[PDB]
Nucleic acid binder design. Structure first.
Ligand SMILES: Nc1ncnc2c1ncn2[C@@H]1O[C@H](COP(=O)(O)CP(=O)(O)OP(=O)(O)O)[C@@H](O)[C@H]1O
Ligand SMILES: [Mg+2]
Ligand SMILES: [Mg+2]
Ligand SMILES: [Zn+2]
Ligand SMILES: [Zn+2]
Lengths: 95, 157, 105, 729, 554, 315
DNA sequence: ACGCCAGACAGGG
RNA sequence: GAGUCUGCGGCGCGCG
DNA sequence: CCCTGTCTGGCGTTCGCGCGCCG
């Protein structure tokens, strides 16, 4: 199946919430630039025509791989709706 | 590997004065077993042309220096009268099975490729019968019977 | 740009009929063969309903987008794609009233 | 009532012709009225097949007639019944009306008879739809034969006696769907009507009178009858069947040959030798492999492809017309206005494609030139044309191309120009152009095959002869059928066909087992006893005896209960062979298969590959005019239906957006799909759905009716679905 | 942990395996179970090929006792005839008695054939597939080695004469033609039965689609009590309900109240694992509990929707239900499939009794979801509601409904029938007005709203006296609040007529209405509980805090 | 009002009705203005009312027919809005997906529940846009329109395209559907493993969920476009993730007919012959004697001998 | 043709 | 800097 | 005028796909 899906399922209060989180995460992953990640260095996402998955294969595949770690934070109202998209474009470069 | 009937264009045609259809012919060709003698012969095109009230067998092919035909009496066709059959059938050295679709040979533009049948062996069989050696009766004896279309011999194989 | 949150069915006021309406079909004239164009006032006239074609009008006085919101001087044709032609509604002014069978039977 | 002649094989058509229907004028009987009509009545005996009734909604209403069944003077399917005066049966027969049949006491054909003499005091008879044990003295009439009970299509089933009526149905139906193989082989085990089929059908070409053969062409066989007359018999070379199957008459008589009255000169589309043939006789091992042969799924040997054993021909008739537009006549010419010569080679003759040309999907079969717009040129395309070369054939490329899927080689071409001979060219239609394309189809994984009994199944894997199950002697098995598919299903007739077939393989002979009267378990064991000597006898003389393997399997076999313990391996294997099973080695490991496995000559046919077989995958394409839902047809596949049941499926899951997508971005959201595409092209994140045209069309459809449906805001206030075309002016 | 959940003391049957996967599911985890699934898949396939099991005509082995039992019953037939030829047995008794002779004699050859294999051929190719959850049916194998004996006439009256043959030996000429009638009548059966399976599903879905999990533990602690014992099999003798059915009732449910049973304290709200339901059964065996207090959709508070503690465990997953799940639908789909699964497999494969079983159920499950006086007045719900009250009807419908599915092999959790049947009583008639005239049928919970604020917030206690109304699934869908939903099934014609007249504002809630629009689903990712959820990186967390720090002016 | 074939024109029957109403209403206006003899005015008002019914609902009162050709009730508005294949049903069930596929299914034994065998030839059409862009990211194609033309013909595909598609589908998943979708497992998500041919390789264990068996039946296939749909599809929809059934808490990934038969055979114990003494339980002479008696032909390796049949004593 | 629901009117106090 | 127009309603049969 | 009963009037009746024909 998929990497630690049960680990992931236990991390959220409701099944369908994890789904929304991963999805919204995959969205930002692409929009503000694909380098908006929290665990790229040593062991990270990878494909094999070359090791090129390091750049842009599957968005959510990363989101899950990150949420599996304890770096990200998902809440009902964590950071004010509009101020987030502003600070995010200010710090992340790829366009 | 390929065939070329002079007046024929497609594989689904029928030639006058010839009972068999191109498809039945090309089929009978897959049955022809030839045997060349050296690497220098990678691709040999056998030529044959017969006319009139004669039966076309594999021995009718004009003989080529380093090539031999171990399938002489194979029936290629039955010509009635005014039966004009002039063809060129290519022959190659390869391995395994190669669908006519995979190689697509084109000596002549109107020629039609044929399914490749490369094993010189039709069937193998082995038996392991107990044999007795003075001390311990529990022993194996292998005897394998090999059949070959003639191209190569059982021992060579 | 708002979100659709409630739908509502309400009977129609004669005036609302006309309100949604554009032109009145007053004759059974579909299309005249010669020219596969709308006959006269007919069930297909472009006035009452819209531009049979893309951005072009009937006769061709005005044919592109530059003058997208104006009507042709001799023939009446305001034009968006033939899409405006499929969304617009026409009306028929009945002589003596009749009634919705939907509410009667 | 008139439909496409089902000519998968002449048999198919013949059946389609004799199947009895209720529905019709509309005056007689309608479709949601008929539980009493649908049932198979008593008198349907030898007048209507009780199995030919197609499975599906339309059922029971349609059913082919029986064997000897024949409409007398007035639509009363009379059935043949022989007279029996006293204890004496006659060779005289009376086609009787169904009413008259109830007045007499009739008996079955199974009654022991010494000639004219009944043989048992208490022998079976049926008064009126009621089983009755009658005395030879009361036996007024007897049935003619077991065949009459059933239809033609059904009488072609081997041991129909051992198969469950319901599973037999499938058998009969399957035949009607048999596709003509270049290599036609009659069954290893037949019923007795294969001959009669092709002959009463007009598959094969029979000799009228006795005579000798003059010319044997591939197109005609001119025979010379002994009456001093000679006739030229053309042979339908390659014709297009309504269903697109090939119909060729293959001469089977050599030059100068005395022919018997009524002998096949040429074989029909699917006849081997005057025998009906749909599919071929192949050695088959009835054991389970990895997962390849699933419950209904079945395997296949690459060796079967090597010799064209399961190969068939399909011809298609593509057609195109040169219409007359008021924009300018659509011309047919070699001129394909915009890009290459590489695509114009095959189009040798000015406009038409040259015969004997291999056309792959996407090639030009026929070239045609129509006009670019509806009535006006293009201001944007006017600047593009002028920049590189203004003088560009204003005409657009509207050429008949090979639709995705496939094409083969062009065999024939038809063109009807201006001065028509005696043809009926439709109005506006300037000229037409037909392009027949043929292609050789080789048995592949997707295909489906089935035996006359009922085991149906698709090919799961084409294994190389290298490692499939092989017999002690190098002869490997052709197909491996899964056992599990026969317990639950009741049709041991198949297991009975494989046993006698086994015999026929080593005894080099075909057999004919009647319906209920055919071969019997003892008689088969007998023939099997004769095959052992051919099998194991040659082995003894050829020089070798038994294997470590062959003996190992015997151990486990005695411990099983198949061979009497204490007898010689030679005698035991015989006993085991009689049981219909022989030892087989894996082929992949050379190890045997612990436990004897039956094997034999089973007749299996290939089922017609409809365009429902040739799969469909759609990315983007056409849309419906009134509804804005995706639709295909010609070259663009067409979208799949998502049905509410499936909706519910996603609904169950938290598949929100997945559900939205389906209802918006993928089908109806006009603006959505568009933006959707571009977005994906860009590798962007798809925009947020706009209103679905379906709702819009709904709204208005509802507005058509008095009702006014309006969308509202947070506070009961408007919101607009129709972005802005609703406001007036 | 592998040997703890495996039974190596018997041949692995589909059930022993079925049990292993389930165990593995709960014990080791979802994906770990998936691994085991493929593992058994692989080895099962491999070993299958090597085992060399294959059918052979001879494999089908006929018992020697067949000839006996046939003759034994044969001579007995002659007794019954002579008993008739004298005038003792009435025309009827004759018939009823002959049938019973075969009904038993057949069942006799049945166990016989198996007895042969059991003792003599343990590894008969045909036998192993049936025992293993592989393939085969006891009534099927009988028709091959034993003999399929009684095939009824066109009408229904079974034939006086049986079918003495098996499929091993030639089923004769006329015995085939007679069997043929039974096949014609069947094929038709599945067609109507398939149409009512979809009927059952559409109805269930049309009434139960708005029902969705959106909550907080609903504080209303009122519940249903699941009975562990059954009254009259034999006049009056209390008995422990069958294992399977009891499991069905309390598996993965939520205790409405705390129960102290054999020594352990089952706390309130705790989700009872199958191990727990094993405990309670063992206790009832001892005699400590006769019913069980458990949360059920049957007593939820959430007007529109069901909470997490009321529903239970079973999401596709084995842990408690996750908020925003489309339960009702799942239920509806689950009742549809079983209908569409059982009548298509019975016309297709085998006999007498089964034909009656399927045809009697489909009519009964259509009369049970829709409210009407049953054929033979079985008992009528409307009247029963009036005389004995609601809480009994609810528990009656549920159990009476499980009765047909248990009897047909299907195993569906009571959960589902509940969600449905609750909606059949989400409505009530009025007897004492306040806001609108008396005779009216309206939303139960909508009355709870009126009465609530009528006595609590605004004074003047105007009791809104209602009567529990038991409407059938069908009628509930027909007449609901929104029109969009109603415009979908009954009469688009009617549905809209009324909804127009009275300017109806379809507030979009529920999946059916909201789908039509092609709008996001109010449930799932649209679920109000999670439609809004943001994600952050510790990097963007500090950044936004730097924006709040710059808020300090000069 | 469309041009069909050869000059045939198709129009929605509504138009016929509309005419009806139009003419009557006109004819009425003129009949009131001309002169109005009572009889003929009502006679017409009658025809008019009727006509007004025709467009809205036909059949509630008599059934109008297109002139002698088809005694068919011209589809009235009411009709266009009511029914199984109606408009209200059309919306509800959302009928036709843009990224869908359907082919014959075939067992794929080595495949894991996690994946499914999907024909590459099919994957190409389905994942066409997703590939077109991937073509540009690599050197196989300059632009989109270029990438399109590169693939409009089968003989034009460079092996390089396959590598691209195989790369696009990396971790995306697709949904499979079966003929009657009875329950939620009626659709499952799997990881496509591009394969050659026409057929689609399905896993055996799920063949229980979908009531499917490789005999003439065929399964459809869809693809999640949004990163969101993708997420849900692979997290909560994937086959392997929906192991228990919604009906019962009992598994649905139960080994089927094939697997059970294999796993059974391997675990069953055999019994054979007891003619001479079966009591090893007590004597030590019983061990020796019946151990040699077994070596002989009297006692089998599996003898009904309580404690241990000689089969156990020997090994 | 059927089955089912819901309905509007007519007969017996 | 490509995009129009055709495939509709019904009937018959066949798959699973 | 009431309640009960009886014929009466309206709707629904799997799901998707192939092919071929016809105005
Ligand atoms: N009239 C009909 N309506 C709907 N589906 C039908 C149908 N006839 C056949 N089918 C469908 O296609 C399948 C064909 O039947 P089978 O393959 O025999 C299923 P089954 O129940 O597994 O029987 P089996 O165990 O003998 O294989 C059924 O599952 C059913 O879903
Ligand atoms: Mg099945
Ligand atoms: Mg099936
Ligand atoms: Zn103008
Ligand atoms: Zn609750």
């Amino acid at each position: 199946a998929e990497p630690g899906i049960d680990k992931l399922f236990g991390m959220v209060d409701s099944k369908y919430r994890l789904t929304v989180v991963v999805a919204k995460r995959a969205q930002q992953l692409l929009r503000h630039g694909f380098k908006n990640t929290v665990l790229e260095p040593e062991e990270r996402p990878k494909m094999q025509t070359l090791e090129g998955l390091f750049d842009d294969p599957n968005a959510v595949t990363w989101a899950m791989k990150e949420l599996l770690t304890g770096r990200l934070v998902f809440g009902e109202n964590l950071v004010p709706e509009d101020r987030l998209q502003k600070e995010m474009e200010r710090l992340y470069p790829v366009e | 590997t390929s065939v070329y009937i002079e007046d024929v264009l497609h594989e689904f045609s029928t030639i006058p004065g010839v009972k068999e259809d191109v498809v039945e012919i090309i089929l009978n060709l897959k049955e022809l077993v030839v045997r060349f003698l050296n690497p220098s012969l990678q691709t040999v095109t056998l030529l044959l042309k017969a006319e009139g009230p004669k039966e076309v067998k594999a021995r009718d092919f004009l003989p080529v220096a380093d090539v031999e035909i171990m399938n002489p009496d194979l029936h290629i066709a039955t010509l009635e009268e005014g039966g004009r059959l002039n063809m060129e059938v290519r022959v190659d050295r390869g391995v395994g099975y190669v669908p006519a679709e995979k190689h697509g040979i084109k000596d002549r533009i109107n020629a039609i490729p044929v399914d490749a049948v490369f094993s010189p062996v039709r069937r193998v069989a082995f038996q392991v019968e107990d044999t007795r050696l003075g001390q311990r009766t529990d022993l194996d004896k292998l005897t394998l019977r090999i059949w070959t279309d003639g191209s190569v011999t059982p021992l060579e194989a | 740009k708002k979100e659709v949150r409630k739908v509502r069915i309400a009977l129609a006021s004669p005036e609302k009929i006309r309100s949604w309406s554009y032109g009145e079909v007053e004759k059974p004239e579909t299309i005249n063969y010669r020219t596969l164009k709308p006959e006269r006032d007919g069930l297909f006239d472009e006035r009452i309903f819209g531009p049979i074609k893309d951005y072009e009008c009937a006769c061709g006085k005005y044919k592109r987008q530059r003058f997208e919101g104006k009507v042709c001087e001799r023939c009446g044709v305001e034009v968006t794609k033939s899409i405006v032609r499929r969304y617009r509604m026409g009306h028929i002014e009945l002589a003596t009233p009749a009634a919705h069978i939907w509410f009667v039977k | 009532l008139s439909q496409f002649k089902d000519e998968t094989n002449p048999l198919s058509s013949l059946r389609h012709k004799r199947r009895i229907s209720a529905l019709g004028p509309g005056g007689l009987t309608r479709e949601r009225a008929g539980f009493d009509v649908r049932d198979v009545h008593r008198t349907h005996y030898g007048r209507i097949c009780p199995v030919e009734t197609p499975e599906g909604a339309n059922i029971g209403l349609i059913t082919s007639l029986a064997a000897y069944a024949r409409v007398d003077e007035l639509g009363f399917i009379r059935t043949p019944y022989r007279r029996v005066v006293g204890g004496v049966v006659t060779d005289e027969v009376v086609y009787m009306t169904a009413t008259e049949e109830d007045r007499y006491t009739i008996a079955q054909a199974n009654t022991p008879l010494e000639g004219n003499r009944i043989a048992a005091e208490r022998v079976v008879a049926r008064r009126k739809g009621e089983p009755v044990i009658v005395s030879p003295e009361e036996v007024e009439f007897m049935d003619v034969s077991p065949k009459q009970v059933f239809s033609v299509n059904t009488n072609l089933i081997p041991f129909l006696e051992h198969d469950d009526a319901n599973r037999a149905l499938m058998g009969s139906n399957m035949q009607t769907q048999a596709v003509p193989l270049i290599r036609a082989q009659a069954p290893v085990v037949m019923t007795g009507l294969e001959e009669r089929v092709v002959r009463d059908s007009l598959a094969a070409l029979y000799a009228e009178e006795d005579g000798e053969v003059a010319k044997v062409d591939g197109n005609r066989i001119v025979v010379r009858y002994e009456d001093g007359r000679l006739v030229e018999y053309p042979l339908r070379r390659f014709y297009r069947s309504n269903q697109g199957t090939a119909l060729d008459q293959r001469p089977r008589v050599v030059v100068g040959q005395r022919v018997r009255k009524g002998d096949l000169l040429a074989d029909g589309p699917a006849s081997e030798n005057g025998f009906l043939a749909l599919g071929q006789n192949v050695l088959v091992a009835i054991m389970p492999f990895d997962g390849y042969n699933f419950e209904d799924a079945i395997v296949i040997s690459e060796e079967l492809l090597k010799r064209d054993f399961y190969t068939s021909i399909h011809i298609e008739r593509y057609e195109i017309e040169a219409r007359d537009t008021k924009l300018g006549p659509e011309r047919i010419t070699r001129d394909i206005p915009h890009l290459s010569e590489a695509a114009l080679r095959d189009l040798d003759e000015e406009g038409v494609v040259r015969i004997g040309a291999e056309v792959k999907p996407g090639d030009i079969l026929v070239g045609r030139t129509s006009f670019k717009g509806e009535s006006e040129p293009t201001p944007e395309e006017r600047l593009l044309r002028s920049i590189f070369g203004e003088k560009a054939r204003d005409v657009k490329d509207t050429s008949l191309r090979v639709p995705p899927g496939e094409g083969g080689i062009v065999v024939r071409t038809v063109r009807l120009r201006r001065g028509d001979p005696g043809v009926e060219l439709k109005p506006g239609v300037r000229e037409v152009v037909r392009v027949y394309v043929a292609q050789k189809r080789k048995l592949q994984v997707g295909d489906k095959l089935a035996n006359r009994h009922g085991n149906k199944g698709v090919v799961a894997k084409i294994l190389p002869v290298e490692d499939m199950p092989h017999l002690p002697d190098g002869t490997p098995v052709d197909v491996i059928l899964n056992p599990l598919g026969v317990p639950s299903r009741m049709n041991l007739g198949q297991i009975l066909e494989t046993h006698l077939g086994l015999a026929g393989y080593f005894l080099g002979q075909r057999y004919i087992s009647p319906i209920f009267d055919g071969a019997k378990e003892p008689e088969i064991k007998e023939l099997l006893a004769q095959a052992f000597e051919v099998y194991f006898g040659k082995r003894k003389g050829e020089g070798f005896g038994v294997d470590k393997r062959e003996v190992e399997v015997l151990r486990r076999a005695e411990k099983l209960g198949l061979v009497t313990p204490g007898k010689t391996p030679e005698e035991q294997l015989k006993e085991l062979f009689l049981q219909g099973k022989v030892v087989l080695y894996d082929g992949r490991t050379g190890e045997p298969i612990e436990g004897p496995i039956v094997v034999g000559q089973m007749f299996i046919m290939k089922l017609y590959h409809m365009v429902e077989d040739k799969m469909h995958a759609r990315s983007t394409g056409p849309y419906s005019l009134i509804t804005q839902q995706p639709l295909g047809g010609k070259a663009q596949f067409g979208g799949q239906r998502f049905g509410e049941m499936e909706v519910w499926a996603l609904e169950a899951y938290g598949a929100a957006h997945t559900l939205q997508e389906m209802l918006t971005l993928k089908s109806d959201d006009i603006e959505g799909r568009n933006a959707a595409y571009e977005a994906i092209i860009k590798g962007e994140d798809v925009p947020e759905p706009s209103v679905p045209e379906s709702f819009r069309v709904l709204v208005k459809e509802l507005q058509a009716l008095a009702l006014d449906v309006q969308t509202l805001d947070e506070k009961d206030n408007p919101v607009d679905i129709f972005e802005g075309l609703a406001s007036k002016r | 942990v592998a040997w703890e959940l495996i039974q190596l003391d018997v041949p692995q049957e589909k059930n022993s395996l079925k049990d292993l996967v389930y165990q593995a599911f709960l014990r080791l985890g979802m994906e770990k179970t998936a691994r085991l699934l493929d593992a058994l898949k692989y080895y099962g396939f491999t070993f299958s090929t090597t085992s060399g099991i294959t059918i052979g005509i001879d494999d089908a082995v006929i018992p020697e006792e067949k000839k006996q039992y046939l003759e034994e019953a044969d001579r007995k037939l002659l007794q019954i005839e002579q008993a008739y030829e004298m005038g003792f047995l009435t025309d009827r008794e004759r018939y009823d008695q002959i049938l019973q002779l075969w009904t038993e004699t057949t069942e006799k050859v049945t166990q016989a054939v198996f007895k042969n294999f059991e003792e003599n051929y343990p590894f008969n190719p045909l036998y192993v597939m049936a025992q293993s959850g592989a393939r085969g049916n006891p009534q099927q194998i009988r028709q091959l080695c034993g003999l399929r004996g009684l095939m009824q006439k066109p009408s229904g009256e079974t034939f006086e004469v049986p079918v003495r043959s098996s499929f091993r030996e030639g089923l004769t000429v006329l015995e085939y033609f007679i069997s043929s009638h039974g096949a014609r009548k069947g094929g038709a059966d599945t067609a109507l039965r398939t149409a009512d399976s979809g009927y059952l599903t559409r109805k269930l879905v049309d009434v139960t689609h708005e029902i969705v999990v959106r909550e907080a533990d609903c504080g209303t602690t009122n519940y249903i009590s699941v009975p562990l014992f059954q009254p009259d099999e034999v006049t009056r003798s209390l008995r422990l309900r069958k294992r399977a059915d009891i499991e069905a009732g309390l598996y993965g449910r939520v205790l409405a109240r705390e129960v102290e049973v054999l020594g352990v304290r089952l706390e309130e709200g705790r989700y009872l694992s199958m191990d727990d339901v094993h405990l309670l059964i063992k206790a009832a065996e001892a005699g400590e509990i006769q019913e069980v207090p458990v949360r059920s959709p049957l007593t939820c508070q959430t007007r529109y929707g069901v909470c997490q503690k009321c529903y239970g465990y079973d999401l596709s997953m084995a842990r408690p239900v996750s908020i925003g799940e489309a339960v009702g639908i799942v239920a509806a789909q689950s009742i549809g499939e079983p209908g569409t699964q059982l009548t298509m497999r019975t016309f297709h494969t085998g006999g007498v009794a089964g034909a009656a079983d399927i045809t009697q159920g489909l009519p009964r499950v259509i009369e049970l979801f829709e409210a009407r006086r049953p054929k033979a007045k079985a008992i009528d719900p409307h009247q029963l509601l009036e005389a004995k009250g609601p809480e009994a009807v609810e528990r009656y419908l549920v159990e009476e409904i499980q009765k047909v599915y248990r009897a047909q092999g299907v195993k569906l959790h009571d959960k589902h029938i509940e969600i449905v049947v609750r909606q059949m009583m989400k409505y009530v008639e009025v007897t004492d007005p306040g806001d609108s005239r008396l005779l009216e049928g309206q939303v139960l919970e909508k009355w709870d709203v009126e009465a609530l604020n009528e006595r609590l917030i605004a004074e003047g206690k105007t009791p809104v006296a209602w009567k529990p109304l038991l409407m059938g699934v069908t009628k509930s869908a027909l007449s609901t609040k929104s029109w969009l939903s109603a415009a979908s099934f009954q009469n688009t014609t009617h549905v809209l007529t009324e909804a127009a007249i009275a300017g109806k504002k379809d507030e979009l809630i529920g999946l059916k209405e909201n789908v039509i629009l092609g709008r996001l689903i109010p449930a799932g990712t649209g679920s109000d509980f999670v439609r809004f959820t943001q994600v952050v990186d510790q990097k963007t967390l500090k950044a936004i805090e730097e924006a709040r720090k710059e808020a300090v002016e000069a | 009002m469309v041009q069909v074939d050869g000059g045939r024109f198709a129009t929605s029957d509504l138009n016929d009705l509309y005419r009806r109403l139009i003419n009557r209403n006109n004819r009425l206006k003129k009949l009131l203005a001309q002169g109005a003899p009572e009889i003929i005015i009502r006679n017409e008002k009658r025809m008019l009312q009727e006509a007004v019914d025709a467009l809205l609902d036909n059949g509630r009162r008599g059934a109008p027919v297109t002139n002698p050709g088809s005694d068919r009730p011209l589809r009235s508005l009411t009709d266009i809005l009511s029914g199984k294949q109606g408009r209200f049903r059309q919306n509800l069930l959302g009928k036709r997906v843009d990224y869908s596929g359907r082919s014959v299914i075939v067992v794929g034994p080595q495949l894991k529940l996690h994946q499914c065998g999907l024909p590459k030839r099919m994957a190409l059409e389905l994942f066409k846009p997703f590939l077109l862009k991937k073509m540009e990211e690599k050197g196989i194609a300059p632009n989109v329109k270029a990438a399109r033309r590169m693939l409009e013909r089968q003989r034009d595909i460079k092996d390089e395209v396959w590598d691209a598609l195989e790369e696009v589908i990396h971790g995306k998943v697709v949904l499979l559907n079966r003929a009657p979708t009875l329950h939620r497992l009626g659709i499952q998500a799997f990881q496509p493993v591009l394969v050659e041919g026409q057929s689609i390789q399905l896993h055996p264990l799920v063949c229980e969920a979908f009531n499917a068996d490789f005999d003439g039946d065929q399964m459809a296939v869809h693809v999640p476009l949004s990163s969101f749909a993708q997420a849900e599809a692979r997290i909560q929809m994937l086959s392997a993730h929906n192991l228990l059934s919604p009906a019962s808490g009992e598994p649905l990934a139960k080994p089927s007919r094939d697997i059970i038969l294999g796993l059974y055979y391997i675990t069953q114990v055999r019994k054979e012959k007891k003619g001479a003494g079966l009591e090893f339980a007590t004597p030590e002479e019983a061990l020796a004697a019946h151990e040699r008696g077994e070596v002989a032909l009297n006692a089998p390796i599996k003898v009904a001998g309580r404690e241990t049949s000689v089969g156990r004593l020997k090994y």
